[PDB]
Amino acid sequence: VSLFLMKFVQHQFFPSSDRPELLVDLNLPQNSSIHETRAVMDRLEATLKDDEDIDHWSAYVGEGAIRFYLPLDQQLQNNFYGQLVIVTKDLEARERVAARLRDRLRKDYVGISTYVQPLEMGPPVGRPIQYRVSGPQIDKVREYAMGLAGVLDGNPNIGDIVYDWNEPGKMLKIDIAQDKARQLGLSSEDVAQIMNSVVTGSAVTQVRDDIYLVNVIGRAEDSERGSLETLESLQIVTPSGTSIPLKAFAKVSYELEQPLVWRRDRKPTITVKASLRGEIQPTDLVARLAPEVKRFADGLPANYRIEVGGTVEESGKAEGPIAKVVPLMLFLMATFLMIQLQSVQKLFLVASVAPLGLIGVVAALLPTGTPMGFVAILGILALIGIIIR
Amino acid sequence: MNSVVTGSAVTQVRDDIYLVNVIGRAEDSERGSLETLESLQIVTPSGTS
Amino acid sequence: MVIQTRWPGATVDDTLEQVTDRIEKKLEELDSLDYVKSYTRPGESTVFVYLKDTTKAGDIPDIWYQVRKKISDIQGEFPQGIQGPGFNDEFGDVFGSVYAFTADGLDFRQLRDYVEKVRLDIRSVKDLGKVQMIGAQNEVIYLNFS
Amino acid sequence: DLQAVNLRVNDRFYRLSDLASISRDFVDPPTSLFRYKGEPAIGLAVAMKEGGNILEFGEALNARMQEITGELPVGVGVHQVSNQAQVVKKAVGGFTR
Amino acid sequence: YLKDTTKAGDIPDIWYQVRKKISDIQGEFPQGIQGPGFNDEFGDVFGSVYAFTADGLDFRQLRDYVEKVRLDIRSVKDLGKVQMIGAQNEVIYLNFSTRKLAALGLDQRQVVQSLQAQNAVTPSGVVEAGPERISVRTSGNFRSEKDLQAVNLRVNDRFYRLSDLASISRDFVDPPTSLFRYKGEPAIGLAVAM
Amino acid sequence: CGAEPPAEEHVRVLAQTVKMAEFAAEHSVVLPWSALSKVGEQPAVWLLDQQGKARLQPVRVARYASEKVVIDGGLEAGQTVVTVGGQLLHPGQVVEVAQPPQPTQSTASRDAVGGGQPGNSRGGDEPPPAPPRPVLTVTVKTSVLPASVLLERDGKTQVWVVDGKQSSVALREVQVLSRDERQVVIGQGLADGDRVVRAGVNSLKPGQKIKLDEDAR
Numbered sequence A: 001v002s003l004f005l006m007k008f009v010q011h012q013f014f015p016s017s018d019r020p021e022l023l024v025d026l027n028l029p030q031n032s033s034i035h036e037t038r039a040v041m042d043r044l045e046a047t048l049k050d051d052e053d054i055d056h057w058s059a060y061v062g063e064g065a066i067r068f069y070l071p072l073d074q075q076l077q078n079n080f081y082g083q084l085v086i087v088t089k090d091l092e093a094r095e096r097v098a099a100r101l102r103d104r105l106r107k108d109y110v111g112i113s114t115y116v117q118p119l120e121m122g123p124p125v126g127r128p129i130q131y132r133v134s135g136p137q138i139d140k141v142r143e144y145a146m147g148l149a150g151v152l153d154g155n156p157n158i159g160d161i162v163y164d165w166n167e168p169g170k171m172l173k174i175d176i177a178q179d180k181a182r183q184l185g186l187s188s189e190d191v192a193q194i195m196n197s198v199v200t201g202s203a204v205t206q207v208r209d210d211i212y213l214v215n216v217i218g219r220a221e222d223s224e225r226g227s228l229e230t231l232e233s234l235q236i237v238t239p240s241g242t243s244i245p246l247k248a249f250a251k252v253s254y255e256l257e258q259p260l261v262w263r264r265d266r267k268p269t270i271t272v273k274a275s276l277r278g279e280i281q282p283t284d285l286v287a288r289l290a291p292e293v294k295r296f297a298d299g300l301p302a303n304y305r306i307e308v309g310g311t312v313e314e315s316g317k318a319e320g321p322i323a324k325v326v327p328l329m330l331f332l333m334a335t336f337l338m339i340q341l342q343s344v345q346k347l348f349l350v351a352s353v354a355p356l357g358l359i360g361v362v363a364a365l366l367p368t369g370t371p372m373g374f375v376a377i378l379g380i381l382a383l384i385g386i387i388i389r
Numbered sequence B: 001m002n003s004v005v006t007g008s009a010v011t012q013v014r015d016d017i018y019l020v021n022v023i024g025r026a027e028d029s030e031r032g033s034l035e036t037l038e039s040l041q042i043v044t045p046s047g048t049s
Numbered sequence C: 001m002v003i004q005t006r007w008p009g010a011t012v013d014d015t016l017e018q019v020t021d022r023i024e025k026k027l028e029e030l031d032s033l034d035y036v037k038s039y040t041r042p043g044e045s046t047v048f049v050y051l052k053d054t055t056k057a058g059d060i061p062d063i064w065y066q067v068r069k070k071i072s073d074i075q076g077e078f079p080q081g082i083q084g085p086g087f088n089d090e091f092g093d094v095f096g097s098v099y100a101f102t103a104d105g106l107d108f109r110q111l112r113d114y115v116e117k118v119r120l121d122i123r124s125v126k127d128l129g130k131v132q133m134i135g136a137q138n139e140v141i142y143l144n145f146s
Numbered sequence D: 001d002l003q004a005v006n007l008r009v010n011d012r013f014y015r016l017s018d019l020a021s022i023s024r025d026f027v028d029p030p031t032s033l034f035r036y037k038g039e040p041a042i043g044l045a046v047a048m049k050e051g052g053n054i055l056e057f058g059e060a061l062n063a064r065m066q067e068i069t070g071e072l073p074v075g076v077g078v079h080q081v082s083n084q085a086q087v088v089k090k091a092v093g094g095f096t097r
Numbered sequence E: 001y002l003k004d005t006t007k008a009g010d011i012p013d014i015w016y017q018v019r020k021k022i023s024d025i026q027g028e029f030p031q032g033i034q035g036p037g038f039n040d041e042f043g044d045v046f047g048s049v050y051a052f053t054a055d056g057l058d059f060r061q062l063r064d065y066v067e068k069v070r071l072d073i074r075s076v077k078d079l080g081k082v083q084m085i086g087a088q089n090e091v092i093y094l095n096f097s098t099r100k101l102a103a104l105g106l107d108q109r110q111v112v113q114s115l116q117a118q119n120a121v122t123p124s125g126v127v128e129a130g131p132e133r134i135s136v137r138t139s140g141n142f143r144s145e146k147d148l149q150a151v152n153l154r155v156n157d158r159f160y161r162l163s164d165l166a167s168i169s170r171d172f173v174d175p176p177t178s179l180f181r182y183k184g185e186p187a188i189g190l191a192v193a194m
Numbered sequence F: 001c002g003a004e005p006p007a008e009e010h011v012r013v014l015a016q017t018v019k020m021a022e023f024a025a026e027h028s029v030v031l032p033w034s035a036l037s038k039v040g041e042q043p044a045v046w047l048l049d050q051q052g053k054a055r056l057q058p059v060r061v062a063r064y065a066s067e068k069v070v071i072d073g074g075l076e077a078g079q080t081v082v083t084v085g086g087q088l089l090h091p092g093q094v095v096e097v098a099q100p101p102q103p104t105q106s107t108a109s110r111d112a113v114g115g116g117q118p119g120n121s122r123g124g125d126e127p128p129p130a131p132p133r134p135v136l137t138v139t140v141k142t143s144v145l146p147a148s149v150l151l152e153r154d155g156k157t158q159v160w161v162v163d164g165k166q167s168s169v170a171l172r173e174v175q176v177l178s179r180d181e182r183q184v185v186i187g188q189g190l191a192d193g194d195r196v197v198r199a200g201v202n203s204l205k206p207g208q209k210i211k212l213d214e215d216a217r
């Protein structure tokens, strides 16, 4: 019955860190000027500026520094990533400061991805639950990621799911026939020159005002640059002194293009990360949702593929050599015992006690509902040794 | 002398993941074999030959 | 391992397909590597290298040197865009207390200068590892023409 | 130093101001911003030299900080963050307990 | 060739020493190209090689298919090095009608400079004109033979088409330097290492 | 052993009905710049059904988008199209009530919220006693002074600190309206010790002593 009941026993690879520090991350729907990120930042700051357990709190617009080797850090995702570190007095959950912040962001503006985070002890694992979908074609992998998240959201024990780089950007395409150019007295050379003077002027030498260096940059007049609305029907000047409206242009229009991609292993892919609810462990949830999602994956061209992105991968990688190493040591200690004894009968006799000890290890674990800890996965061997002793 | 052996070099092109470097050169009706390279009425930048 | 690479503006698709793809393909041949995380932006390329968590420590610098070698030669093929390996190793491992110097109604320049003076005076302390500032400001000079 | 640059005679030697607008130096569109208690600031992270005996480096550091404060000019607010020396102290204390 | 009396393992150190000794001295050579080929010979083991014969098609598309094969191969469990052979690098000759060029009073060097200034300009760039991220993109840079066949010049420079002045030779493969052949027939092999 | 997960919560969102407008494009449709998503090989948006669910509708945008995307074609007169997206479930999505003008208190939080006491800032609270900072020692026998030096807050903190031998306080409450945010010029109420600190004004307590030894290298 013990080995039988072992099935629903939940396992977890690592607990969190009791450090009184806490962090929160935010991601905007689409990439905008960093000014918008700072706007959301200052608003959230003005919201939390006077309360107990609220002290030593700083912001991060575009990048988060590193305290210890505990977490990772999104390097440069200014237009899509922010950070806020806060220090509590005795416990981040003392008054459930994290829950209060969750309610705050809930009442806050919509379409703003946000996530709370208590420091974690152990090798970095990023989000607790993720999934990676591959595809050599943009729209194909996108629609498939959508069709996957649809089935994934079946179980309501997950708070929310978030895709990756699943949004395009307003691109402006322009081109010229060059016939009217030579007709009006314009050459491709001056064409490119003007085009440069409109976006980013030419570069010149730097200056040495102090130990630092400042590079000066040229540019045309700004009374013709700054906003797209004013860039409509532009009477562009010519090097010959003349000025003609932009009517000589063509195909000037709006298009869509996602400015962020992930060519994991030289192949485009998307990473869908999801928050949790209740109290279950990501491993158990993965095991539960394994069949249906597997069938869904099967229902797709072979050139595509899906993989998990949670913590099961890391746990398995860590326990990898364990299985391929421990039995040898088992036979080693067995022979060691046979040294003191002289009969296989007594050997098997004392050996019978070894496995039977798994009674208490689970009896004192099921009522408490404590997940199977890795440390326990290790200590059980010490238990075997002492009981055999 | 350069336009006769190997013309000047210009910018490369990006037609695909690879790069193709274009090269200039004079007219080939005056290059290719040594026999024809005998008694060459070489042109001058001033139009003369 | 983090490897950054800039470019003076170009269509993100072409940017990746040209610089990122070549870097990834060339580096792929490297041994003992497991994950090759690509990262693209309008004009930035970033490569994340993750080796297998099965190798011994100590020789890690050798692998880093191998990476530097593999990219040094191939560098002679990229276009005129900038390029430089960011961190062969992540020195940003330990960090003691950090100190913020708030101020208003003054020169950010003089602020950074004071911070540098602080660094010089700090060097006098007994033991010191790395000292790194943040949020620096680099003033530029635009020259608009009539 | 560049506003009064001339040109050639046949080039109509004029002042840069007389021809273009010499925009005063200014900070570019930010790419990384730091902020303390909702207020802009500039932090400085320091690392302990490898092999350095911790719990003492911080002592000498804070002492030197006190001296620096003694020399801190006008309009300067020093704020310490992540004083791990205290963290380690409390940790080892509870451990030994 | 080092002496066959040293221990293994430290060989990379010797290679690094070589790289060091040449790095500094590099600052003295003339404008000629230079690059250390192999600090070590990675070409040690090689599993089966595969030749992909074909005729009546593009060598370009052939290499593209081989690259697609490489990408699909990466899916295999273990992989060492993957190297192709006998690749083709098409070039583009631009022969000029020197006589007519001189007749027009100009020289091809000026055309070279103009084309350089035209190609060195990126046809796109981020603008962020509004709150959201925005960027512009034009179609004016050289990307093919036709992309340069219709280039003009200045008024005082007799703005004409390249065809009207020079012969835009279609891209073609250069005089070979390394040729592969299977059963007396041209092909392209692919060596893979474990 | 087994618990109960919480109920499902519709993903909060702020949409808006469809109202044909002649915004310069007959019967054109305008919306904020953050309400466009590419589907297949064309732009599109999300429309919300009356029975609390979301669906995708392909569109064909032709008009320029200057912070406000303007499309023409594929519309439903009086349909609540999304204007906040980027993370919704493409196949179907149970949406949250977006009917309020601002279902978020952000429409008034910018001015005032009302939860608890306000935060802190230099100029309203008392700084802790610290060693005397080497004064700015900008005093010169006298005029104009950079606006950064003076830190007058609501007229209750005129830079009264005297630049003399003690760094005391004085009765210098002269206020000139020539406030061009660049320099303050006064004709009366000026003296030799009239100047004050540049940045450490509000962060300094009145009458606090200073030190003559200044940092320089």
Ligand SMILES: *C[C@H](COC(=O)CCCCCCCCCCCCCCCCCC)OC(=O)CCCCCCCCCCCCCCC
Pocket (backbone or CB within 6 Å): A366, A367, F001, F002
């Ligand atoms: C973790 C698990 C669940 O806790 C429970 O207690 C579940 C039962 C629901 C509560 C009802 C309590 C029963 C009352 C007992 C009678 C009085 C006892 C009072 C105590 C005396 C002390 C003085 C106050 O707890 C467990 O460890 C047991 C779980 C084992 C069962 C798991 C179910 C999995 C599938 C079972 C297959 C059944 C096969 C037979 C066909 C139906």
Ligand SMILES: *C(=O)CCCCCCCCCCCCCCC
Pocket (backbone or CB within 6 Å): A367, A368, A369, F001, F002
């Ligand atoms: C599954 O996880 C079960 C949920 C119910 C938990 C109820 C709390 C159990 C604690 C048992 C302690 C008994 C003490 C008896 C004292 C006389």
